[PDB]
Curated annotation (Swiss-Prot):
PANTHER family: MYOGLOBIN
Binding positions (heme b): H93
Modified residues (Phosphoserine): S3
PROSITE patterns: GLOBIN
Protein's recorded name: Myoglobin
Residue intervals of the Globin domain: 1-147
Oligomeric and partner information: Monomeric.
Binding site for nitrite: H64
Gene3D superfamilies in the record: 6.10.140.2100, 6.10.140.2110
Function recorded in the entry: Monomeric heme protein which primary function is to store oxygen and facilitate its diffusion within muscle tissues. Reversibly binds oxygen through a pentacoordinated heme iron and enables its timely and efficient release as needed during periods of heightened demand. Depending on the oxidative conditions of tissues and cells, and in addition to its ability to bind oxygen, it also has a nitrite reductase activity whereby it regulates the production of bioactive nitric oxide.
Length: 152
């Protein structure tokens, strides 16, 4: 797990996200979609978005970004005690949305990129280490649920 110090770093970084949840959410999804276009195909509501301009101009994409990061923030603030919060997410993503764990790796990487991009020089080595651990933990706990379900 993460140490108390590490959790404190994670939630300190998360302060940045909470000052502009929609802006961070939007940039994360744009980073995901642009770098990994196959991921767009998992969203019937975003498949029409043929350019990054269209993405940036989509109010509904920003709205979804807010839903996404609010859910992740809820999870993070549990500091690893997130079984109740994580289980239904794991299950909807495997069973309904059919999201391979690879795409969760992609979005983890996107969050790290976006934090650097929006806060250059203000996302230190220790912070990146802590946030990365927290995201791997999220990812790994989801992967356990995927295995249970036999979802690939
Ligand atoms: C590559 C694609 C996917 C990735 C990566 C991804 C990563 C993440 C993620 C990681 C930080 C969090 C937190 C996250 C959280 C959500 N997510 Mn998710 N998600 N996610 C979807 C694709 C993806 N998610 C799709 C598709 C829906 C349904 C969208 C619609 O309303 O049409 C959805 C829906 C949701 C919903 C709405 C409730 C539900 O359906 O369970 C939440 C909350």
């Amino acid at each position: 797990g993460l140490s108390d110090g590490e959790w404190q770093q994670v939630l300190n970084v998360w302060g940045k996200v909470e000052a502009d949840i929609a802006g961070h959410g939007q940039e994360v999804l744009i980073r995901l979609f642009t770098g990994h276009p196959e991921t767009l195909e998992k969203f019937d509501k975003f498949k029409h978005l043929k350019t990054e301009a269209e993405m940036k101009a989509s109010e509904d994409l920003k709205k979804h970004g807010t839903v996404v990061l609010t859910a992740l923030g809820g999870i993070l603030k549990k500091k690893g005690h997130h079984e109740a919060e994580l289980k239904p997410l794991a299950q909807s993503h495997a069973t309904k949305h059919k999201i391979p764990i690879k795409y969760l790796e992609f979005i983890s990487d996107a969050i790290i990129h976006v934090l650097h991009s929006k806060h250059p020089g203000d996302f230190g080595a220790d912070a990146q280490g802590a946030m990365t651990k927290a995201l791997e933990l999220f990812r790994n706990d989801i992967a356990a649920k995927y295995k249970e379900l036999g979802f690939q």
